């Protein structure tokens, strides 16, 4: 009814998307909601097309959307990405990731979807 | 089949200035107005400081402020308006392309000029 949790905020959306893009950079396969999947796919594609020339200013520009993981740390994963993904993905115009729709969840019946990337 | 929807400029070509006096939104310009009340040619040079320079195509409106009778007044004008002559008096330096503080700031209403 009346006053409750703050719930969904734009800050929540952007920080969650940052978590997902960090996760896909670390491993490369995330199972989540299809709408959230495409919403983060747009931002990931924007970051990757911003990951072509890679000056220090672009390093900070893309760092404004990255976090840390257990396998890699922030600067280390940035450098790792810069070293491998950019040579692999530079020559393809767009389409740097794909989402595949899974089935409902026994726990939640949510339409699961897997984001993956391979060029 | 495919339509570009760019015909906006195609219909805008009906009105095109060949000199197009260009200025920022923080300058002092004198714009002349041609008026025929009943039968006469009246050239009223409306001086004043431009406030906001907006532009999107054929529709380009800009705001100008003038101290008439010591009273500040704001007028809107269109860049390609017919029977209208435009000539800048002084070009200055302004840090923003949209000003709302000049709506109230009257003390030293002038602006720092451009080097």
């Amino acid at each position: 009814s009346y006053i409750n949790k703050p719930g969904k905020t734009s800050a929540w959306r952007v920080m969650t998307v940052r978590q997902q893009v960090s996760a896909v950079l670390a491993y490369g396969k995330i199972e989540t909601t299809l709408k959230k999947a495409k919403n983060t796919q747009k931002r990931l594609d924007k970051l990757i097309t911003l990951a072509k020339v890679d000056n220090f200013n672009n390093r900070r520009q893309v760092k404004k959307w990255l976090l840390n993981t257990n396998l890699f740390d922030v600067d280390q994963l940035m450098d790792h990405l810069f070293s491998k993904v950019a040579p692999k993905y530079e020559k393809t115009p767009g389409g740097y990731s794909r989402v595949l729709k899974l089935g409902p969840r026994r726990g939640d019946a949510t339409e699961m979807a897997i984001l993956q990337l391979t060029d | 089949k495919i339509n570009k929807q760019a015909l906006i400029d195609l219909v805008e070509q009906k009105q095109l200035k060949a000199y197009v006096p260009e200025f920022s939104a923080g300058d002092e310009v004198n714009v002349a107005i041609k008026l025929k009340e009943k039968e006469k040619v009246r050239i009223q040079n409306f001086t004043g400081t431009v406030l906001r320079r907006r532009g999107k195509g054929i529709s380009e409106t800009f705001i100008v402020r003038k101290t008439t009778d010591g009273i500040p007044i704001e007028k809107n004008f269109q860049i390609h308006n017919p029977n209208i002559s435009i000539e800048l008096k002084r070009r200055g330096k302004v840090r923003r392309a949209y000003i709302s503080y000049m709506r109230e700031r009257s003390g030293k209403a002038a602006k720092i000029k451009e080097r």
């Binding site: - | 009340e37 409106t61 009778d69 009273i71 500040p72 704001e74 007028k75 809107n76 269109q78």
Partner: protein, 122 residues
Amino acid sequence: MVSFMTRLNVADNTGAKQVGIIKVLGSTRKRYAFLGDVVVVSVKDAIPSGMVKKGQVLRAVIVRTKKGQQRKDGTHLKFDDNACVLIKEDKSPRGTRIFGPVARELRERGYNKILSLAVEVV
């Protein structure tokens, strides 16, 4: 934008300072401000040298619109204040000294005498 009970300044030399627009003439549901609007006003701030007594219900016309308006020309002039001039049932102004800037497109409702005795027309 400007309607009943609007505390406004005077635009002509009648020895009055603050006047309130108390009613709108013309037709029902006018309730808005435009050029040449003949309304009735009551004065509460004035000077003893003024030609009108305090609280009198006398007819006036607003000349300055803080809202502003868009004309047939395609240009939107807007005032940065509001003012009015008191007249007695005709086109001859009451004050003996006219001041204040006004557009020349006011001849549609008359008031040619005010323009002829104006300091300068916009």
